[PDB]
Scaffold this active site. Sequence first.
Site, PDB file in Angstrom:
ATOM      1  N   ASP A   1       1.378  -2.180   9.142  1.00 59.22           N
ATOM      2  CA  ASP A   1       1.584  -0.824   8.684  1.00 59.22           C
ATOM      3  C   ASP A   1       2.999  -0.347   8.988  1.00 59.22           C
ATOM      4  O   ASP A   1       3.227   0.542   9.804  1.00 59.22           O
ATOM      5  CB  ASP A   1       0.535   0.112   9.276  1.00 59.22           C
TER       6      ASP A   1
ATOM      7  N   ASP B   1     -10.811  -3.874  11.343  1.00 58.83           N
ATOM      8  CA  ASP B   1     -12.053  -3.919  10.572  1.00 58.83           C
ATOM      9  C   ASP B   1     -12.758  -2.571  10.473  1.00 58.83           C
ATOM     10  O   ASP B   1     -13.317  -2.236   9.432  1.00 58.83           O
ATOM     11  CB  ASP B   1     -13.017  -4.964  11.143  1.00 58.83           C
TER      12      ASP B   1
HETATM   13  N1  LIG Z   1       4.023   8.240  20.370  1.00 56.54           N
HETATM   14  C1  LIG Z   1       4.402   9.342  19.610  1.00 56.54           C
HETATM   15  N2  LIG Z   1       5.354  10.177  20.052  1.00 56.54           N
HETATM   16  C2  LIG Z   1       5.733  11.224  19.344  1.00 56.54           C
HETATM   17  N3  LIG Z   1       5.179  11.500  18.173  1.00 56.54           N
HETATM   18  C3  LIG Z   1       4.220  10.729  17.648  1.00 56.54           C
HETATM   19  C4  LIG Z   1       3.790   9.603  18.362  1.00 56.54           C
HETATM   20  N4  LIG Z   1       2.827   9.012  17.610  1.00 56.54           N
HETATM   21  C5  LIG Z   1       2.644   9.682  16.513  1.00 56.54           C
HETATM   22  N5  LIG Z   1       3.477  10.754  16.492  1.00 56.54           N
HETATM   23  C6  LIG Z   1       3.590  11.763  15.443  1.00 56.54           C
HETATM   24  O1  LIG Z   1       2.298  12.032  14.867  1.00 56.54           O
HETATM   25  C7  LIG Z   1       2.426  11.973  13.428  1.00 56.54           C
HETATM   26  C8  LIG Z   1       1.099  11.500  12.819  1.00 56.54           C
HETATM   27  O2  LIG Z   1       0.729  10.272  13.443  1.00 56.54           O
HETATM   28  P1  LIG Z   1      -0.306   9.233  12.807  1.00 56.54           P
HETATM   29  O3  LIG Z   1      -1.816   9.700  13.074  1.00 56.54           O
HETATM   30  O4  LIG Z   1      -0.157   7.894  13.417  1.00 56.54           O
HETATM   31  O5  LIG Z   1      -0.056   9.133  11.232  1.00 56.54           O
HETATM   32  P2  LIG Z   1       1.206   9.050  10.263  1.00 56.54           P
HETATM   33  O6  LIG Z   1       2.065   7.791  10.787  1.00 56.54           O
HETATM   34  O7  LIG Z   1       1.960  10.318  10.261  1.00 56.54           O
HETATM   35  N6  LIG Z   1       0.717   8.856   8.675  1.00 56.54           N
HETATM   36  P3  LIG Z   1      -0.439   7.655   8.481  1.00 56.54           P
HETATM   37  O8  LIG Z   1       0.101   6.233   9.014  1.00 56.54           O
HETATM   38  O9  LIG Z   1      -0.745   7.586   6.904  1.00 56.54           O
HETATM   39  O10 LIG Z   1      -1.673   7.965   9.238  1.00 56.54           O
HETATM   40  C9  LIG Z   1       3.557  10.955  13.153  1.00 56.54           C
HETATM   41  O11 LIG Z   1       4.261  11.200  11.924  1.00 56.54           O
HETATM   42  C10 LIG Z   1       4.499  11.265  14.308  1.00 56.54           C
HETATM   43  O12 LIG Z   1       5.343  12.315  13.867  1.00 56.54           O
HETATM   44  O1  LIG Z   2      -2.249   3.968  14.628  1.00 59.12           O
HETATM   45  C1  LIG Z   2      -2.811   3.158  13.913  1.00 59.12           C
HETATM   46  N1  LIG Z   2      -3.055   3.450  12.641  1.00 59.12           N
HETATM   47  O2  LIG Z   2      -2.610   4.651  12.172  1.00 59.12           O
HETATM   48  C2  LIG Z   2      -3.451   5.500  11.385  1.00 59.12           C
HETATM   49  C3  LIG Z   2      -3.826   6.717  12.229  1.00 59.12           C
HETATM   50  O3  LIG Z   2      -3.656   7.919  11.466  1.00 59.12           O
HETATM   51  C4  LIG Z   2      -3.294   1.890  14.520  1.00 59.12           C
HETATM   52  O4  LIG Z   2      -3.951   0.961  13.790  1.00 59.12           O
HETATM   53  C5  LIG Z   2      -4.287  -0.073  14.705  1.00 59.12           C
HETATM   54  C6  LIG Z   2      -4.960  -1.256  14.438  1.00 59.12           C
HETATM   55  C7  LIG Z   2      -5.196  -2.161  15.473  1.00 59.12           C
HETATM   56  N2  LIG Z   2      -4.774  -1.881  16.710  1.00 59.12           N
HETATM   57  C8  LIG Z   2      -4.107  -0.734  16.986  1.00 59.12           C
HETATM   58  C9  LIG Z   2      -3.853   0.194  15.976  1.00 59.12           C
HETATM   59  C10 LIG Z   2      -3.214   1.440  15.837  1.00 59.12           C
HETATM   60  N3  LIG Z   2      -2.609   2.245  16.775  1.00 59.12           N
HETATM   61  C11 LIG Z   2      -1.683   1.932  17.721  1.00 59.12           C
HETATM   62  C12 LIG Z   2      -1.225   0.632  17.886  1.00 59.12           C
HETATM   63  C13 LIG Z   2      -0.291   0.332  18.868  1.00 59.12           C
HETATM   64  C14 LIG Z   2       0.206   1.331  19.700  1.00 59.12           C
HETATM   65  C15 LIG Z   2       1.217   0.961  20.733  1.00 59.12           C
HETATM   66  C16 LIG Z   2       1.036   1.717  22.040  1.00 59.12           C
HETATM   67  C17 LIG Z   2       2.099   2.161  21.048  1.00 59.12           C
HETATM   68  C18 LIG Z   2      -0.242   2.641  19.533  1.00 59.12           C
HETATM   69  C19 LIG Z   2      -1.183   2.940  18.546  1.00 59.12           C
HETATM   70  F1  LIG Z   2      -1.610   4.210  18.394  1.00 59.12           F
HETATM   71 MG   LIG Z   3       0.498   6.244  11.807  1.00 57.38          MG
END
Ligand SMILES: Nc1ncnc2c1ncn2[C@@H]1O[C@H](COP(=O)(O)OP(=O)(O)NP(=O)(O)O)[C@@H](O)[C@H]1O
Ligand SMILES: O=C(NOCCO)c1oc2ccncc2c1Nc1ccc(C2CC2)cc1F
Ligand SMILES: [Mg+2]
Length: 286
Positions: free
Chosen positions: A130, A157
């Site tokens: 991703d 999964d």
């Molecule tokens: N470790 C982090 N530190 C700071 N901001 C974060 C962190 N992780 C996620 N974010 C913020 O949270 C927002 C949303 O996170 P996330 O649920 O992973 O989905 P997304 O990457 O925006 N879009 P999607 O991958 O389609 O779900 C991201 O765009 C970041 O701006």
């Molecule tokens: O965020 C994910 N999908 O994003 C859609 C949510 O809106 C995600 O999909 C996974 C699939 C399998 N194992 C893990 C993850 C994982 N998350 C993840 C992985 C690694 C880290 C590293 C510590 C930083 C942080 C995470 F949040």
């Molecule tokens: Mg994301």
Amino acid sequence: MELKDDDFEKISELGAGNGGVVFKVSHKPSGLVMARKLIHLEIKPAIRNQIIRELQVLHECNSPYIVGFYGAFYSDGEISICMEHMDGGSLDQVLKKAGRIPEQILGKVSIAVIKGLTYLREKHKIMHRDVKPSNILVNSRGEIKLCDFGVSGQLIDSMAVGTRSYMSPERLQGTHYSVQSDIWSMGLSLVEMAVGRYPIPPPDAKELELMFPPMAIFELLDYIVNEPPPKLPSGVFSLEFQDFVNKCLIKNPAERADLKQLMVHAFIKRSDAEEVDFAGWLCSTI
Ligand SMILES: Nc1ncnc2c1ncn2[C@@H]1O[C@H](COP(=O)(O)OP(=O)(O)NP(=O)(O)O)[C@@H](O)[C@H]1O
Ligand SMILES: O=C(NOCCO)c1oc2ccncc2c1Nc1ccc(C2CC2)cc1F
Ligand SMILES: [Mg+2]
């Protein structure tokens, strides 16, 4: 130390996405500020254990190019992943305020993504799965790190789409995909950050002179898999950058450049040398 739900306390919300929501939280016992991602899953205790069990390898994922892990657990219908707060957000966010991202910066981003994917592959046999601008985080020390990568098979999964794919043509078309797919996702992300918007469909000759409706699902996937791939617009980007992304966006995954090759590409070698105050430019941009 082990993390649990009651040891935390919300500061604010960092945003959400398809499936997950992320909070800026304080871990009361340590005093540490963390980003806590919650993922809603209705799932039997057997598998939610395997997921949490599989996420432990994040403790062994240490890299300047990979977001830090504090710990993972299951709460109430939600598995939490606790990670390094990146005070600078995702490149998705910085793209919004910045409009475009300078080629010089992008070269620095490119370096991070390659080294990060390489780390995950070489030391863990993990493919990202991703790659897009929102899963590339930045902070004020000028670090660039990857998150939200495919550590846990079972989580993959259990999550089994949107209006914008960063999926390679091969992955859109079947199950015949692998690590080369990440290269494509990168290529596309760069073009998007380069230009200021999602590169598909490619801009009209007009739209270009301007810079310098939203598509139907099938209409867009059908483009990705069947039309020639997007390209950096001629002229305003170095010939080297253009070749770099063209190598990333080759439709045939075996013809497409790999991590090895991209690491020694003209564009990378050139960006490696460049003195860039990434940190300075980032905060300036906010
Ligand atoms: N470790 C982090 N530190 C700071 N901001 C974060 C962190 N992780 C996620 N974010 C913020 O949270 C927002 C949303 O996170 P996330 O649920 O992973 O989905 P997304 O990457 O925006 N879009 P999607 O991958 O389609 O779900 C991201 O765009 C970041 O701006
Ligand atoms: O965020 C994910 N999908 O994003 C859609 C949510 O809106 C995600 O999909 C996974 C699939 C399998 N194992 C893990 C993850 C994982 N998350 C993840 C992985 C690694 C880290 C590293 C510590 C930083 C942080 C995470 F949040
Ligand atoms: Mg994301």
